[PDB]
Paper text:
Active transport of proteins from the cytoplasm to the nucleus is mediated by a family of nuclear transport receptors known as importins (or karyopherins), together with a number of ancillary proteins including nucleoporins and Ran1–3. The W proteins of henipaviruses share a common N-terminal domain with P and V proteins, but have a unique NLS bearing C-terminal domain that is recognised preferentially by importins α3 and α4 (KPNA4 and KPNA3), rather than the better characterised importin α1 (KPNA2). In this study, we present high-resolution structures of importin α isoform adaptors bound to the NLS regions of HeV W and NiV W, providing insights into the molecular basis of importin α isoform specificity.
Importin α1 and α3, crystallised in P212121 and P1211 space groups, respectively, both contained one chain in the ASU. Superposition of importin α3 in the cargo free and bound forms showed that the N-terminal ARM repeats 1–4 are repositioned by up to 5 Å, consistent with previous findings that a more flexible hinge region is present in importin α315. These results suggest that ARMs 7 and 8 do not undergo conformational changes to accommodate binding of the W NLS in either importin α1 or α3. In addition, we show through structural comparisons between apo- and W bound-importin α3, that structural changes in the N terminus were not associated with direct binding interactions in this region. This mechanism of isoform specificity is well suited to cargo containing NLSs at the N terminus, and our structural data of the unbound and NLS-bound forms of importin α3 supports this model.
Numbering used by the authors: 72 to 486
Amino acid sequence: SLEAIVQNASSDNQGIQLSAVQAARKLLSSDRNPPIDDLIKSGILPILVHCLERDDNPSLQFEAAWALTNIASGTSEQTQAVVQSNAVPLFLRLLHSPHQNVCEQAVWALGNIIGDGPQCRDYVISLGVVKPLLSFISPSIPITFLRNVTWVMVNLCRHKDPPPPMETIQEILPALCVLIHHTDVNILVDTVWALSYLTDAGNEQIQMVIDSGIVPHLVPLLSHQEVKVQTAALRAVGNIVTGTDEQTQVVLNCDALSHFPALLTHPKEKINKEAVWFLSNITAGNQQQVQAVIDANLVPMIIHLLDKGDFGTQKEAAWAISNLTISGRKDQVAYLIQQNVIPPFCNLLTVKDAQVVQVVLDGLSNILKMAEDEAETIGNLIEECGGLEKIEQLQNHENEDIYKLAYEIIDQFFS
């Protein structure tokens, strides 16, 4: 009797209330076809939200929290019905309940709400969720509960186009510093993905992450046995090394490069690609960082991937080679030449990704300009592998930066 349940829940007698709220909860969480929509149309939601305030009856508070949780675990329309009934401030309140089960049910409901979309997430942040959420992280916490805590932290951290507030980041980072030493794979995945979302927000957030002290704990996860950890960590440090040279050097000082031979040869193409992206951000640095890439014996592996990798990896390797020519010294570029970069580099001149074509022409141009006396030898190598015919054809490309640079190269070195 759904009507009866609604009427009884509104009674002043708290035991009849408990019976009714328990009945609604049992209708919702006990079957594989719950009547969620029917309970919403009944008008029960504001009653349950009122029940969440009853600290003097924790069984009633628990049951109402569980009912609303299960409604919020449903479809987007069901979660939004919960949000529109003003449930959120009451769940944030229940994060400070002394009763663990009410706290766990509040975390779960808030997770579903935050997951519905960006404005609900930003509402929950604006109401102060982070401090009480992170307060749960302790040595005695059950792992299932901690997993739900960390999932909510990731989801608070993930929609980036709204940058989360800086002060929230200051609250979240100490928790990540704690969690990065956890052994549970799901906790590590969530912690590191959260870090990678923070590190994608800009150089100032990168600096906050650096200043937290977490990078020497983060870098070694590049060699974790679990691939999900490896790929989260590779994203996080790659984003750090999109920052300044000094921020990149923070990563290098952790011996990051020692992890890369096993990433360039990893069976997963996605790890090869992400690793070469990382390296391309190292070679865009100063002469010493270029030399760090050379001295780690990584250049032959990059050139191999430039030649035989999947296109996404090939594009990243093209960037890594061309970026090396930005600040690299003549002898470092000469080392590239000795390692037979030219044929596979020139083989990318014919692809449909115009950005890659431009990158390759930029690198070839830089190489030719840098070889004071050997420019003729290098021009001959470019000719031998068909690079010259390809450059000649690029004079007719639609894109002005390409055809201009092809003309300039042809005028300076093959005329």
